[PDB]
């Protein structure tokens, strides 16, 4: 039906633009830039202009938070189209701010909020419409009080907008439009989508679970390092679904004697029961319910048991979802993670560069920036930053922007024009990057890598084999069932140092857009020296929760070398950490699409048990890079560096016969550093590109890292493992 | 409820335990179920509060007072058989112990059929395909899977026909399609994935070719004492409770153990070399006891110790590293073997590729006293390997698998497994390429292409050493001409 649509979140941040689809417009006969009168629930309605985009489905309309709240509806609700009958332009339109959103800032609101928002933008306005505008490092809401030319109008440049004063009191059943929402979360698409899925039916459709009886998820546990926005995500979900958000703070619960703690837990659960669909959020769950063995007080044990029995009592269809955030997935009572109490677990995790960019764009939307703030350069060099680190960085830059113009124009309830006249310059961000101190620097990176097959030259057979083991079971799961045969879940790269094993693993992960986890030799040696091989389990857990994933074990022979050679020190090839890796590999399913890649420069000293079937059964030799791979190395290292066009990198890759990838990396690490040095000397004497002479000067110090004997040994190993037997003449008779 | 009892101060907890027992007494035959017993009564040594100790002691005295004929049975569930007060497991308090354990594929199928009886399914939901690939799932995991699939079925038709006390016809018009189950299988996260599997295996004697003497000996040691306990008493002689398989890698020791377990429909417990090495590295050889407990509670059972020489290899060779052939974990295995009864019908099977470096103490009588050599598979066994791996795979009829098993002279079972792992994977690759260029069976050309990369895993010298060991342990002496006079 043309008068029945479903609400979705708007991609853009436009105040009064709704996105639809061309097939929907086909049955509506509407233009690209016309206006319609959308009628919402509770008799309310608004006027908005439509837009065309292909992201939404045929019968889905995208609306932003402010227009969605104007219609008194939420995501997924039913909204008609009802095109507006072309109401003429407005004349006076009186608008006033809301008292709560204007408190603290006073002055003339025309040149700062009203005029820039209404400049060169014909935005429809109704009597009951309230609109939010971002400026002066704030988000302020304005409500229209009256409109002389009919209740509907369209803002014209000559319209004399009036703002007398006396801000209106906040209404009864209208919520703040800038507190929390899905658009306040940065790049948590997978996790936020998971939470939306688990939470949609229990809360948006409560009577369904009083009439069907299927058990919905009752306990969701958000876990991840601190500062990743778990509380923010829970608040956003509760606000968007409209369910009553009850917040339980771990420290606040545990700061109240030995009485009121239990009373407060019980009262929170009863209040959530008495108040319709609700989300109970228990922030810092490990403060309330840690491992009951490590507790050394009776009241703590009673707190944990009371939480357990409250969670068990929330097995009925009371429409109360209990959410909990912890930084300790393994330091909360295991009895909480059982079925019926906290069944679902969501790992928030570190934001990637895209997520960091999204968070930075969210935190800087109200702030007036400059033109030089890239906001993507910082997002690429904020490694190890959780969203809280990024918020701290943004606030630090903004504060230093205020620390440069601090007492020039006095900020004595201060005027709006001076507030709007601020700017943050990119060098402030580059300053804060050196004063950042990321919290999650020492955290396992789980991200789809940016290495593609372009960054790798040659290795055509290796690329083919890798995509046979990874790309086929992922992108063609129809096979491996028709033929009834599981994909191999592991491969062992072997070859000389510096030949692209890491890049091959990253590129195969990126081709399937799979997560990539790298476990380097120092980490295996850390587990071996400290006898903390139990952490191997955790690594595989991270791989399983991040599926599809490539779990890469670089220099898998590190422990074997640390023990000596092939024998080692008296003992055999088995060690505790590689034994744990074997155990964890046997415990995977091949249906998780977790692929293990081990790399070793010394396949001779590797434990043979890891080469057995059901393990890294395929061995791939990664040889010394051929000339095409050398050209790729040179191009990849030289990209991001201004290099002269006359350099014959193809020629450069011809006498680098037995050179490894690290050899050419050092070749530019020297030529390009000579260029830097020449720049500095010429700048000293005076006060653009890596020339051919720089590359000749660097090649004058070119040495092969891997000797001929080592290459001979690698070739011998490859022969004895790949030359097979004399079965090349086999043929079925007739 | 454990948590509910322990959530009530230091008063009402005891009062509630007492009142529960008195209410059960006053109300005829009754079952008191104490769910999560370890919450109420853990190891009193690990308790660090007076009220917890009083709770345990009050439970003990209530259970002792329920020694009269009050017709009250007390049931209790725990996930901790070894983390509840041992004083509860004494005679008169909690005498009987029932291990529920992981459901098998049949049990998982039954649970799925139970959870889907009210649900309106589709025609494509096999409900047995999922039951076979829900390994590591307890019934709660299966219930979560079923609810997840049903919810996604509701997440595909969510706001089309409005579910505003809603009508019955729309409720009856739902369906869950098999791809929903296959979706949830990748989002399953089984709770009991890392749990010891104790199940009757599906391997039969058909999946094994040849090994006629080995099959005969295995059924002499396992099938006879189980299916003919009338003997071994008439002749007054206990069956041997252990055997040691030895032979080259990839020759069917695991399959032989599984098949002998399945013939008697006995439980099968497999303890692989990484687990023995885990106990050895961590010095947690006490867990050997637990393994044997699992074997004893699952009786009749075949307790299989695959690669029993793993610790000996990890130490080096026959001598190892200075020391002798004894190690803590194999010593615990010896201790546990001496403590069995042969009346439980628990059979130990050890497998080793290196019988030379095995501790000789494990070969003594009352232990794995019989040694069986599992040689490189003969042509019939090769044909069985090829047929078993190729089953579940569409393979052309013109392939002469019998011929294929003729030049695979010194090939091991793993060699032929890799032969199809390559031919059948070439078939998959050809399918994908032809599907890319375009947009059925493993042909003979695929098998020839795979055999072009056929290598023997086990060398002639290793086979010679295995044969030498078999001779010095089985050629015996020159007593073949013995005969009683007259
Ligand atoms: N085939 C290749 N394609 C792209 N880059 C390559 C290739 N071979 C080597 N390199 C270059 O080598 C450098 C790093 O080598 P890499 O880490 O892949 O080596 P490796 O084979 O894992 O060996 P090692 O264990 O000795 O570090 C990078 O500069 C990379 O560009
Ligand atoms: N006699 C046999 N009957 C059936 N399958 C066999 C036989 N011999 C080998 N195989 C095949 O070998 C593969 C696995 O071998 P298996 O696990 O039984 O070897 P093993 O003797 O225990 O040696 P290892 O300790 O080296 O793994 C399977 O593909 C199986 O089909
Ligand atoms: N994913 C995110 N997107 C946007 N802002 C974030 C994100 N994560 C953290 N922040 C910022 O960090 C601040 C604190 O995050 P917080 O909710 O305490 O983390 P957690 O919820 O993990 O304890 C929030 O005010 C928010 O502004
Ligand atoms: K917060
Ligand atoms: Mg938190
Ligand atoms: Mg490497
Ligand atoms: Mg229970
Ligand atoms: Mg074996």
Curated annotation (Swiss-Prot), chain A:
Belongs to the AAA ATPase family. Changing residue 138 to H: In IBMPFD1; without frontotemporal dementia; abolishes enhancement of K-294 methylation by ASPSCR1. Necessary for the fragmentation of Golgi stacks during mitosis and for their reassembly after mitosis. Involved in the formation of the transitional endoplasmic reticulum (tER). The transfer of membranes from the endoplasmic reticulum to the Golgi apparatus occurs via 50-70 nm transition vesicles which derive from part-rough, part-smooth transitional elements of the endoplasmic reticulum (tER). Vesicle budding from the tER is an ATP-dependent process. The gene is VCP. Changing residue 348 to T: In IBMPFD1; uncertain significance. The modification N6,N6,N6-trimethyllysine is found at residue 294. GO terms for molecular function: ADP binding; ATP binding; ATP hydrolysis activity; BAT3 complex binding; deubiquitinase activator activity; identical protein binding; K48-linked polyubiquitin modification-dependent protein binding; lipid binding. ATP 1 binds at residues 226-232, 327, 363. Changing residue 366 to H: In IBMPFD1; uncertain significance. The modification Phosphothreonine is found at residue 413. It comes from Homo sapiens (Human). This is Transitional endoplasmic reticulum ATPase. Changing residue 293 to A: Does not affect methylation by VCPKMT. Changing residue 555 to Q: Does not inhibit interaction with RHBDD1. Increased interaction with CAV1 and UBXN6. Impaired autophagic function. Defect in ubiquitin-dependent protein degradation by the proteasome. Phosphorylated by tyrosine kinases in response to T-cell antigen receptor activation. Phosphorylated in mitotic cells. ISGylated. Changing residue 284 to Q: Defect in ubiquitin-dependent protein degradation by the proteasome. Homohexamer. Forms a ring-shaped particle of 12.5 nm diameter, that displays 6-fold radial symmetry. Part of a ternary complex containing STX5A, NSFL1C and VCP. NSFL1C forms a homotrimer that binds to one end of a VCP homohexamer. The complex binds to membranes enriched in phosphatidylethanolamine-containing lipids and promotes Golgi membrane fusion. Binds to a heterodimer of NPLOC4 and UFD1, binding to this heterodimer inhibits Golgi-membrane fusion. Interaction with VCIP135 leads to dissociation of the complex via ATP hydrolysis by VCP. Pfam families: AAA, AAA_lid_3, CDC48_2, CDC48_N. One of its GO terms (biological process) is positive regulation of canonical Wnt signaling pathway. Keywords: Acetylation, Amyotrophic lateral sclerosis, ATP-binding, Autophagy, Charcot-Marie-Tooth disease, Cytoplasm, Disease variant, DNA damage, DNA repair, Endoplasmic reticulum, Hydrolase, Isopeptide bond, Lipid-binding, Methylation, Neurodegeneration, Neuropathy, Nucleotide-binding, Nucleus, Phosphoprotein, Transport, Ubl conjugation, Ubl conjugation pathway. Its EC number is 3.6.4.6. ATP 2 binds at residues 498-503.
